[PDB]
């Protein structure tokens, strides 16, 4: 019943954050204070679309 639509592997390329979990935890509070707007935009998009494929940008 239909074909699942999956984005190409090119669509999933991004320059990743290659720091370990300790580095993330050390800077977590300032990261949350500073990067709030893009993060909240993504999360709202995520719970509203209910689809990973609609939230890549």
């Amino acid at each position: 019943p239909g074909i699942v639509e999956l984005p190409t592997l090119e669509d999933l390329k991004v320059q990743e954050v290659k720091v370990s979990s300790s580095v993330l935890k050390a800077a977590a509070h300032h990261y949350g204070a500073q990067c709030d707007k893009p993060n909240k935009e993504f999360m709202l998009c995520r719970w509203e679309e209910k689809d990973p494929r609609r939230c890549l940008e």
């Binding site: 999360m43 995520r46 209910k50």
Partner: protein
Amino acid sequence: WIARTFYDGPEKNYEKTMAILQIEAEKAELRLKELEVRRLMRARGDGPWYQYPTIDKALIDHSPKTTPDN
């Protein structure tokens, strides 16, 4: 004298029989109709009868569920 004292005219019995026949013919028609209606409702389920219960929709929680994909 016997007819005057104890009995009644033919018209009384005649019309009473007409009324009784009407009542019982209506009852027979209603019985057939009831059987047909019961068969139809039980087969279809679109009437007030034979309505079997289903899950209430007021039980579902409509809130973010700690995960975007529910």
